[PDB]
Amino acid sequence: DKPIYTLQYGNVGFVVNPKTVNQNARLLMGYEYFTSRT
Amino acid sequence: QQAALRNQQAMAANLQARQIVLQQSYPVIQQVETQTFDPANRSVFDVTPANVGIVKGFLVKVTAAITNNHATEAVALTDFGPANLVQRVIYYDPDNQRHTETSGWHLHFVNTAKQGAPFLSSMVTDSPIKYGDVMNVIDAPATIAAGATGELTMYYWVPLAYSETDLTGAVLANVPQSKQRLKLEFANNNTAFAAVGANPLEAIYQGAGAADCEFEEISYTVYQSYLDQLPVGQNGYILPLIDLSTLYNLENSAQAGLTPNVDFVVQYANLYRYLSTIAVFDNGGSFNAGTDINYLSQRTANFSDTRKLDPKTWAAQTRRRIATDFPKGVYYCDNRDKPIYTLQYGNVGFVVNPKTVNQNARLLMGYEYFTSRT
Amino acid sequence: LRNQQAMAANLQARQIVLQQSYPVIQQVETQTFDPANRSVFDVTPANVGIVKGFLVKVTAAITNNHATEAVALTDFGPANLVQRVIYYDPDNQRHTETSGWHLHFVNTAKQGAPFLSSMVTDSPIKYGDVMNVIDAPATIAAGATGELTMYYWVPLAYSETDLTGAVLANVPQSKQRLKLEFANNNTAFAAVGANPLEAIYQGAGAADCEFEEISYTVYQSYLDQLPVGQNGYILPLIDLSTLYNLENSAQAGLTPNVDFVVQYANLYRYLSTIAVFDNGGSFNAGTDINYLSQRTANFSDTRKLDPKTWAAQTRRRIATDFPKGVYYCDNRDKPIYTLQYGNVGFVVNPKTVNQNARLLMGYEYFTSRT
Amino acid sequence: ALRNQQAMAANLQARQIVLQQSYPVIQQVETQTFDPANRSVFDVTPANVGIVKGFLVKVTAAITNNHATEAVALTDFGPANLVQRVIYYDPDNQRHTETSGWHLHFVNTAKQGAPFLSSMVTDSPIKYGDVMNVIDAPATIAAGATGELTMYYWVPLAYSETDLTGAVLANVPQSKQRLKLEFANNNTAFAAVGANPLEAIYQGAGAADCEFEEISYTVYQSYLDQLPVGQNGYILPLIDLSTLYNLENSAQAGLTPNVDFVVQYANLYRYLSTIAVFDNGGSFNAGTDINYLSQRTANFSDTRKLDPKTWAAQTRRRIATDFPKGVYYCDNRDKPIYTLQYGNVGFVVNPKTVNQNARLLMGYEYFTSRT
Amino acid sequence: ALRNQQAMAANLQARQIVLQQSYPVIQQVETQTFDPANRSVFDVTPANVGIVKGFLVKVTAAITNNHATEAVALTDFGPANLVQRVIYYDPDNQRHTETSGWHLHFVNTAKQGAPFLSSMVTDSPIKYGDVMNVIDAPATIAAGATGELTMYYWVPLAYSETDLTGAVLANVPQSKQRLKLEFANNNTAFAAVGANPLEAIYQGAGAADCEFEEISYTVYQSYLDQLPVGQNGYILPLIDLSTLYNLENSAQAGLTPNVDFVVQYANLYRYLSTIAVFDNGGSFNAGTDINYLSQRTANFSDTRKLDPKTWAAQTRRRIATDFPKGVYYCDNRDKPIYTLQYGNVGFVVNPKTVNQNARLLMGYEYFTSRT
């Protein structure tokens, strides 16, 4: 209903504060978005 | 084209009004709330401060009683100790805009940086007159033996205004409608005590008796500092509009991905004017006195380092600022006179080139900055 | 109108004086004596240029003649080597009239650290307490003799750069009077259980302690070679027509959980306030107080704080705590000033009140000669 | 006189613009690790870039006491004696500072207002403290042990971070600067019992068998880059850049009990500070061998004739502690001693006791024009 | 837009005239022989003459393996690690290249189109071959032996012999250039078995007892003299001389198996080439620990997503052989990566295997304007 949209790169971020971090840990992100062809 | 005269005039008007406000109003520090609680029941509180005049900041007093119930083993203070009594603090002004949002340890290190010495500490001297640690303003037993109870006191200053004379960041709280909000997330029995070998970063005590340590209670008192009886003029209240429309915030973040002998770079965002930077090298739960670092630096898009220094030389610059060293693995950078601003030059980054990198290593960054409300 | 120009001129003249004159610190008097014979002295400073203040050096040897009991420093210790000080200028107007301990605490407040102390650091280079500038043995054992050194700065001018309160004596002719009352064998030693407020040492051997002798040297600090202009000497008339004084007082009548209010007088611009809670001879670290504050009638408290938070504000000013039961309040940037007597008061709400309890007040203030 | 007042105004404005427009940089120039038994004098070549303010010199060392049974203990100056002498020459080969490591260190302390780069002890439970050992040396080195030392010196060109008087403009590609560092060696660093400890780092019964294992130095150059350009090229504070801010030291002898020993400020320099070390024949005393010290003008009048403890009191107001035994300091920063404003001036010491080979080591901080 | 097209035309014409009228010169600037145990960082001062194109640095060294029984063998980078870092600052103290010796060497090879200054093996009976040992290092140094090494690096300012983009005009007598060389020492040059060989020259069971005996360097400066003068003074390619051509490197971590690791071209530079070294926790593999590599635009589309061998095939077309194990190259010279022409772009590596302490060492070659 209100898409994340910033005019500046990273004016918004997705946050994860981990309690436990094993070796080779990583976040695999997936995005759905709209953007102009031009 | 030009017309930039507006800015020049705006700055002058802002400074003039700031001075008038400082000269005409009277400073007040008043208690707004006090509570004693058991962390086992609750540890997060939302304080609603009073809406009176221009708010400069909050002095937060925190006391606690901790009992080590272990049958045989003791615990000892971590490097941060009582500074971890508050885990996180977040402030929202009447317009619901967020200002400071950071960890208690970061807020405390900035309190120290701005004082020019360990915050509210008692220096030691040869004076025969009995000055000294008489009142235990910030205090915590170095160790708590098996079966013993220790008493702690620590204070945090949550700033809105930059200082007592620079009202940049201050908040005008006169709208009866919306309240300010000061959120405090305190330590509890799950964050305050670290077992041997566990990461001590957020803990108060660490040791073989940690699993049996518990808070008997925690108490806090929030004092609000503000300016009352604001000066009025032909156009109504005289107010520094730039000061009151600028946010002075502290924020922290975490980054990982360090590798031995490779530059680890943390970019500064644009728009923010960074006054200070703190970098904590949490080397997988180990905090070392510079020995796990080749050098630290601040660098601009141009491979140009403005202060690429070995750890001890970096530490020397900090000794000139706070008269001692920050705890192991905590590094400070003062950019107050010439704030890092990515518009002034290209992008800029804070650099750490590690010598040794343990598993789960990360850099915890703390920033002090000014930014336009709009 | 006016004034804007009067002050502007005053400040200009001050600047010219500081820029053109030359500072001098000169010994004016030294004396050694036995307090068994005398303990009050009237020192006559030199009438030269603009006088800024006096540095008073006091040394003493104390012998514990007790057979087996020792004595130990009180909280004020050597700061009680001088019991009182009074200064009269060439026009017979008094400036400071206060106790040695209050004077010492103000010296500390103005320095921003324990006065003339040596700060401890990790430096391997041997800086440290090399010269024992202010010094006194923690204890003097039965049969032993201890050597003490104390310094006090009696201010006329507010600071090295603010000449408010300074005294013009290059002309006056009439003499200045710096009166000093030293500790004696009756005030310096407190028996166990007795009030240690005014004493230097307290302990089981006190009754047999005595001064071997006391010596003092007064150094006068002034500005010479004053600048001359058209109308003559260029002088900051406001600075020289303002008194910067320290004064003390005592108040009693405290009762548990009730606000004890000490009214500030009108006319005076109070820069700082010190309140000592002499709780019947007991000096506690805030545990006998609920809160302290400064209050305006019909405008409430401007800083009602618990003792530790009050102490926190002081730690920002002197980098440590004053001794037990000693509370400080800085109002330098905005001096307490009421047109009506007591339109403002200093408040102490006591938690515990022993017999013979009282608050010993100390004030730093500016006021017009006229 | 109008040409001067306007000259000073132009200078300050230029200084202010340079400070506002340029960006400060501190960067490593050179690092070297060596054994002083092999070589102890080094000529470092600073980079020629912008306006140079000074050099921060990091010095580390490892010392081993191989005596069979006896230890050695730090002298009063200790690690400040790791560098024996420092000399700087600018691109025109004009000499600025030339003094001892101990004098330079004492000025660094005076300018900081506290023991240089020290860590102040407080009651804070948070673990601030001597964490990084910026300036450090073990109090003693026992027979058979090896101690590690770290020392820092700031070699100034500019007077301060905001006052560029004494700074050096180094933008001439073929004219090099020279920073000469003369380090301690086994001969200077270790003093036998009873020998003069002035220049030594450690003194004790194990001295003859002490040896450096190595010394290392890293020189960082502090300067201002991206100099502002205007309608005439670089906007530069001409007075600042043509004034020398130097430190120098000398030794004076001829002291006799109860007689005023006067050291005349022999040059027409503007003396900002004076340090007097009473090396009483190898003995360094806490004022007990002195009646008084003073600064006096030809007019025979004293501006501050003080007993030793009172003299020390003035210093405690400046550096929050006392300088080591026998070291006396005098601040004249706001009103520099300048013999052309008043008669010749002298620094005075009236000794109470004078041992054989007694002397006053004088250290000066001053401004003087290139021409 | 007309002001630009004409600006570029004027630049090229000026460049062409400078190249036709001036005469190229290459001359020694400085030579020094030293033991890195004593000093390993040197600030060389180039001569201020005409337009400077670059520096050819000759480096020789003697290394002795004093282990009782074990040898050491060259690492994959070997003598390219004789210089650890190189940094250049021009007369205005603007920094150009700042990178590692190995990265600089790989770019020298990429620009030559074959291993830099190597001798190609052929069937010729005439005795051409490795006669002069221009770049040379013994494959192994046995216990008790001493090996001799020679290495050359070209530090570029100008992009090439014919393209003066990035060149430096050094005709300001008092503004010096700075070429800082940080050499290998016993700590960086020798890696024990199992230790990371990235920065080392030799690795083996005899490493702990290996020592440099000496290192020597000679810097030659290449420049253009007798600059053409016209009706306005020197005819100069203004765009060429106000553009920086630099090399820089950085390290990136955070790799996980089968997941795309993306390194964003974070600056608005015009990236001519990219080198990615997969230091897989001290292990350097021949593509077997990688699924694919690619360059990708915000549009999420890949312009060259390739398996490792096919990626290597493209590089073989550029340098006639493969770079060492774990070193990947990408040529973008004709169409430089420039994030302002298309969305942000990223260099991608999707690893098949990721060891502890894995990281990508990124090396970039790029153009950027001074302002």
Tab-separated table of C-alpha atoms in Angstrom, chain D residues 43-340:
chain	number	residue	atom	x	y	z
D	43	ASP	CA	67.796	12.204	8.744
D	44	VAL	CA	64.116	11.935	7.868
D	45	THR	CA	62.865	13.685	4.729
D	46	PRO	CA	59.368	15.168	5.177
D	47	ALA	CA	57.042	15.308	2.165
D	48	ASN	CA	56.782	18.711	0.486
D	49	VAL	CA	53.067	19.389	0.642
D	50	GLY	CA	51.046	22.453	1.585
D	51	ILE	CA	51.572	24.173	4.916
D	52	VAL	CA	53.378	21.908	7.419
D	53	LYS	CA	52.339	22.256	11.083
D	54	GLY	CA	54.518	19.676	12.802
D	55	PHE	CA	55.513	16.049	13.234
D	56	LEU	CA	54.273	13.403	15.628
D	57	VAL	CA	57.087	10.931	16.286
D	58	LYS	CA	56.230	7.509	17.712
D	59	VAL	CA	59.230	5.748	19.269
D	60	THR	CA	59.256	2.200	20.652
D	61	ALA	CA	62.111	0.215	22.157
D	62	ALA	CA	62.978	-3.071	23.810
D	63	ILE	CA	65.671	-3.022	26.508
D	64	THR	CA	67.253	-6.063	28.144
D	65	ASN	CA	68.987	-6.133	31.516
D	66	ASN	CA	71.498	-8.988	31.384
D	67	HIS	CA	73.112	-8.237	34.730
D	68	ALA	CA	73.565	-11.367	36.805
D	69	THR	CA	71.668	-10.055	39.809
D	70	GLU	CA	70.910	-6.324	39.853
D	71	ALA	CA	67.960	-4.370	38.468
D	72	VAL	CA	67.717	-0.869	37.037
D	73	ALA	CA	64.941	1.652	37.605
D	74	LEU	CA	63.586	4.484	35.498
D	75	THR	CA	65.277	7.842	35.860
D	76	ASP	CA	63.043	10.887	36.390
D	77	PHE	CA	62.902	11.542	32.617
D	78	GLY	CA	62.792	7.883	31.623
D	79	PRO	CA	61.398	7.293	28.125
D	80	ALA	CA	61.547	11.014	27.331
D	81	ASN	CA	65.273	10.301	26.885
D	82	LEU	CA	64.700	7.769	24.058
D	83	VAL	CA	65.389	10.678	21.693
D	84	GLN	CA	68.486	12.635	22.719
D	85	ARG	CA	68.180	15.432	20.178
D	86	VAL	CA	65.900	16.691	17.435
D	87	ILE	CA	66.745	19.275	14.759
D	88	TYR	CA	64.546	20.574	11.952
D	89	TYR	CA	65.561	22.551	8.826
D	90	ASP	CA	62.993	23.969	6.385
D	91	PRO	CA	63.181	24.023	2.531
D	92	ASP	CA	65.441	27.115	2.647
D	93	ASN	CA	67.671	25.244	5.097
D	94	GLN	CA	66.729	27.637	7.878
D	95	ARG	CA	66.957	25.854	11.216
D	96	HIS	CA	63.924	25.936	13.496
D	97	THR	CA	63.848	23.789	16.627
D	98	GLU	CA	67.050	22.152	17.896
D	99	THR	CA	66.720	20.743	21.392
D	100	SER	CA	66.787	17.678	23.612
D	101	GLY	CA	64.086	15.037	23.739
D	102	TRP	CA	63.428	15.840	27.395
D	103	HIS	CA	62.962	19.564	26.749
D	104	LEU	CA	60.687	18.954	23.763
D	105	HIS	CA	58.640	16.559	25.869
D	106	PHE	CA	58.265	19.070	28.727
D	107	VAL	CA	57.020	21.704	26.264
D	108	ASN	CA	54.560	19.152	24.800
D	109	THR	CA	53.248	18.729	28.378
D	110	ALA	CA	53.111	22.482	29.044
D	111	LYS	CA	51.154	23.037	25.814
D	112	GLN	CA	48.710	20.213	26.612
D	113	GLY	CA	48.088	21.468	30.150
D	114	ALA	CA	48.804	17.978	31.552
D	115	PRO	CA	51.508	15.261	31.209
D	116	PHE	CA	51.677	14.747	27.435
D	117	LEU	CA	49.408	11.975	26.113
D	118	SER	CA	48.969	10.608	29.632
D	119	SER	CA	45.978	8.654	30.941
D	120	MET	CA	44.331	10.321	33.980
D	121	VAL	CA	43.270	8.030	36.849
D	122	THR	CA	39.577	8.262	37.898
D	123	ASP	CA	37.021	6.254	39.912
D	124	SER	CA	35.088	5.288	36.757
D	125	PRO	CA	33.895	1.634	36.861
D	126	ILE	CA	33.766	1.636	33.037
D	127	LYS	CA	37.165	0.344	31.912
D	128	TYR	CA	38.793	3.516	30.629
D	129	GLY	CA	42.421	3.768	31.659
D	130	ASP	CA	45.843	2.871	30.356
D	131	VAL	CA	44.448	0.554	27.697
D	132	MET	CA	46.689	1.389	24.753
D	133	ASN	CA	49.982	2.251	26.489
D	134	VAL	CA	50.573	5.325	24.350
D	135	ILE	CA	53.533	6.545	26.463
D	136	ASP	CA	54.749	3.715	28.710
D	137	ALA	CA	57.906	2.191	30.279
D	138	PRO	CA	58.281	-0.403	33.046
D	139	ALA	CA	59.238	1.173	36.379
D	140	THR	CA	62.068	-1.344	36.728
D	141	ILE	CA	63.757	-3.961	34.571
D	142	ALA	CA	65.021	-6.851	36.702
D	143	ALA	CA	68.194	-8.826	36.062
D	144	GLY	CA	67.466	-11.133	33.137
D	145	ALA	CA	64.366	-9.288	31.940
D	146	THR	CA	63.379	-7.380	28.824
D	147	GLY	CA	61.149	-4.291	29.027
D	148	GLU	CA	59.150	-2.609	26.258
D	149	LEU	CA	58.811	1.164	25.965
D	150	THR	CA	56.681	3.552	23.931
D	151	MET	CA	57.188	7.297	23.653
D	152	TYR	CA	55.706	10.114	21.565
D	153	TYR	CA	57.058	13.568	20.755
D	154	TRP	CA	55.322	16.361	18.865
D	155	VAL	CA	57.875	18.462	16.925
D	156	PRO	CA	56.100	21.779	16.286
D	157	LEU	CA	56.520	24.184	13.369
D	158	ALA	CA	53.149	25.946	13.813
D	159	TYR	CA	52.547	27.220	17.357
D	160	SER	CA	49.169	25.470	17.639
D	161	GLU	CA	46.236	23.999	15.733
D	162	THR	CA	44.747	27.512	15.386
D	163	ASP	CA	47.813	29.764	15.435
D	164	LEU	CA	49.938	29.105	12.335
D	165	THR	CA	52.846	31.270	13.500
D	166	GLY	CA	55.959	29.210	12.767
D	167	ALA	CA	54.356	26.949	10.154
D	168	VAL	CA	56.275	26.054	6.988
D	169	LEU	CA	55.117	26.361	3.386
D	170	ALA	CA	56.570	23.333	1.596
D	171	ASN	CA	55.522	23.464	-2.049
D	172	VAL	CA	58.940	23.711	-3.729
D	173	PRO	CA	59.498	20.279	-5.413
D	174	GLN	CA	63.312	20.381	-5.316
D	175	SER	CA	63.983	21.927	-1.881
D	176	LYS	CA	63.785	19.274	0.846
D	177	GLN	CA	63.099	19.666	4.555
D	178	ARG	CA	65.214	17.759	7.077
D	179	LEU	CA	64.093	16.284	10.393
D	180	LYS	CA	67.149	14.890	12.169
D	181	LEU	CA	66.558	12.482	15.042
D	182	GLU	CA	69.448	11.472	17.308
D	183	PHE	CA	68.430	8.480	19.439
D	184	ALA	CA	69.655	7.107	22.742
D	185	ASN	CA	72.190	4.242	22.647
D	186	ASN	CA	73.680	1.945	25.297
D	187	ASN	CA	76.056	4.732	26.382
D	188	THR	CA	73.375	7.376	27.034
D	189	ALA	CA	70.453	5.245	28.206
D	190	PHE	CA	71.954	3.476	31.195
D	191	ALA	CA	73.451	5.161	34.246
D	192	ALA	CA	75.430	3.380	36.953
D	193	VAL	CA	74.579	4.085	40.594
D	194	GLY	CA	76.021	7.474	41.510
D	195	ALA	CA	76.395	8.586	37.880
D	196	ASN	CA	74.404	11.595	36.542
D	197	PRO	CA	70.927	10.332	35.417
D	198	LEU	CA	70.027	13.450	33.390
D	199	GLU	CA	70.235	11.911	29.899
D	200	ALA	CA	69.554	8.318	30.897
D	201	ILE	CA	66.423	6.171	30.725
D	202	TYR	CA	67.324	3.630	33.432
D	203	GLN	CA	69.723	3.806	36.396
D	204	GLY	CA	70.781	1.073	38.800
D	205	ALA	CA	73.363	-1.495	39.852
D	206	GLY	CA	72.618	-3.514	36.722
D	207	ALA	CA	73.326	-0.672	34.258
D	208	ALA	CA	76.638	-1.921	32.824
D	209	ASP	CA	74.889	-5.013	31.453
D	210	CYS	CA	71.838	-3.313	29.958
D	211	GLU	CA	71.450	-3.139	26.190
D	212	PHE	CA	68.843	-1.957	23.715
D	213	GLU	CA	67.597	-4.873	21.585
D	214	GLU	CA	66.008	-2.434	19.158
D	215	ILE	CA	64.384	0.948	18.674
D	216	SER	CA	61.713	1.770	16.104
D	217	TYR	CA	60.303	5.125	15.013
D	218	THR	CA	57.440	6.239	12.831
D	219	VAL	CA	57.170	9.864	11.822
D	220	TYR	CA	53.755	11.299	10.976
D	221	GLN	CA	53.591	14.675	9.244
D	222	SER	CA	50.706	17.010	10.039
D	223	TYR	CA	49.844	19.564	7.360
D	224	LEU	CA	47.083	21.529	5.638
D	225	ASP	CA	46.090	20.549	2.107
D	226	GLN	CA	43.908	22.132	-0.600
D	227	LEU	CA	45.176	25.619	0.200
D	228	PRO	CA	42.669	28.383	-0.674
D	229	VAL	CA	43.392	30.373	-3.832
D	230	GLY	CA	42.254	33.939	-4.467
D	231	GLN	CA	42.877	36.997	-6.645
D	232	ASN	CA	46.676	36.795	-6.325
D	233	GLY	CA	47.174	33.059	-5.955
D	234	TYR	CA	47.400	31.336	-2.575
D	235	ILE	CA	45.865	33.244	0.325
D	236	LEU	CA	48.645	32.957	2.910
D	237	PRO	CA	49.392	34.451	6.353
D	238	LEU	CA	52.712	36.063	5.399
D	239	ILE	CA	53.748	36.970	8.940
D	240	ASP	CA	52.895	33.475	10.240
D	241	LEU	CA	54.987	31.809	7.519
D	242	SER	CA	58.025	34.069	7.905
D	243	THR	CA	58.204	33.713	11.678
D	244	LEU	CA	60.118	30.874	13.329
D	245	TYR	CA	58.656	29.126	16.375
D	246	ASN	CA	61.592	27.255	17.932
D	247	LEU	CA	62.731	25.338	20.998
D	248	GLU	CA	66.394	25.388	22.053
D	249	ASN	CA	68.336	24.514	25.171
D	250	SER	CA	71.711	25.371	26.679
D	251	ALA	CA	73.710	24.803	29.841
D	252	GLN	CA	74.862	27.470	32.280
D	253	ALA	CA	77.357	27.021	35.121
D	254	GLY	CA	78.817	29.212	37.859
D	255	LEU	CA	76.429	28.811	40.795
D	256	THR	CA	77.419	29.624	44.366
D	257	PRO	CA	75.337	29.373	47.576
D	258	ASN	CA	73.035	32.284	48.428
D	259	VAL	CA	74.109	34.265	45.394
D	260	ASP	CA	71.770	35.191	42.549
D	261	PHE	CA	72.610	33.193	39.446
D	262	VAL	CA	71.245	35.177	36.518
D	263	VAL	CA	70.739	33.777	33.015
D	264	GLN	CA	70.168	36.708	30.677
D	265	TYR	CA	67.634	36.299	27.898
D	266	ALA	CA	70.578	36.984	25.552
D	267	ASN	CA	68.660	37.217	22.274
D	268	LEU	CA	65.986	39.574	20.918
D	269	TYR	CA	63.564	36.647	20.646
D	270	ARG	CA	60.035	36.677	22.045
D	271	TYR	CA	60.375	34.018	24.763
D	272	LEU	CA	57.076	32.202	25.351
D	273	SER	CA	58.332	29.833	28.063
D	274	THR	CA	61.442	28.995	30.030
D	275	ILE	CA	62.402	25.716	31.642
D	276	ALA	CA	65.296	25.578	34.096
D	277	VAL	CA	66.652	22.233	35.258
D	278	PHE	CA	68.900	22.376	38.300
D	279	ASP	CA	71.319	19.521	37.665
D	280	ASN	CA	73.028	19.864	41.029
D	281	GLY	CA	76.060	17.742	40.190
D	282	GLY	CA	73.935	14.757	39.237
D	283	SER	CA	71.495	15.305	42.080
D	284	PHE	CA	67.944	16.425	41.297
D	285	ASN	CA	66.128	17.838	44.294
D	286	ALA	CA	62.545	18.873	44.967
D	287	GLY	CA	63.280	22.561	45.587
D	288	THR	CA	65.223	21.976	48.801
D	289	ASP	CA	68.489	23.211	47.242
D	290	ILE	CA	66.972	26.537	46.164
D	291	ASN	CA	66.133	29.726	48.099
D	292	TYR	CA	64.046	31.297	45.324
D	293	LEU	CA	63.598	31.665	41.573
D	294	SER	CA	62.578	34.771	39.683
D	295	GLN	CA	62.414	36.716	36.433
D	296	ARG	CA	64.048	40.135	36.716
D	297	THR	CA	64.455	43.223	34.542
D	298	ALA	CA	67.464	45.540	34.293
D	299	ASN	CA	65.463	47.845	36.581
D	300	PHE	CA	66.537	45.316	39.247
D	301	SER	CA	62.858	44.689	40.054
D	302	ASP	CA	61.417	41.150	40.225
D	303	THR	CA	58.067	40.383	38.563
D	304	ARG	CA	57.776	37.034	40.351
D	305	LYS	CA	60.428	36.312	42.989
D	306	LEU	CA	59.087	33.135	44.617
D	307	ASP	CA	60.115	30.429	47.062
D	308	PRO	CA	60.235	27.003	45.334
D	309	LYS	CA	56.875	25.710	46.531
D	310	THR	CA	55.077	28.863	45.463
D	311	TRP	CA	56.841	28.753	42.109
D	312	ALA	CA	55.644	25.108	41.865
D	313	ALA	CA	52.104	26.241	42.734
D	314	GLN	CA	52.024	28.432	39.619
D	315	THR	CA	53.137	25.470	37.523
D	316	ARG	CA	50.452	23.240	39.067
D	317	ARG	CA	47.906	25.719	37.671
D	318	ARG	CA	49.437	25.188	34.228
D	319	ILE	CA	49.944	21.393	33.980
D	320	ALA	CA	47.820	20.088	36.873
D	321	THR	CA	50.833	18.498	38.578
D	322	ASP	CA	54.570	19.147	39.171
D	323	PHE	CA	57.376	18.633	36.637
D	324	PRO	CA	60.033	16.086	37.826
D	325	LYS	CA	62.524	16.903	40.589
D	326	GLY	CA	64.700	19.879	39.783
D	327	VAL	CA	62.679	20.937	36.743
D	328	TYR	CA	61.175	24.436	36.932
D	329	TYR	CA	58.810	25.998	34.444
D	330	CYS	CA	57.822	29.580	33.681
D	331	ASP	CA	54.908	30.548	31.382
D	332	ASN	CA	55.255	33.881	29.506
D	333	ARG	CA	52.876	33.055	26.651
D	334	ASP	CA	50.515	36.023	26.877
D	335	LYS	CA	53.337	38.535	27.463
D	336	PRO	CA	56.523	36.998	25.961
D	337	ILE	CA	59.862	38.127	27.372
D	338	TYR	CA	61.203	40.594	24.788
D	339	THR	CA	64.283	42.621	25.805
D	340	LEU	CA	63.359	45.434	23.431
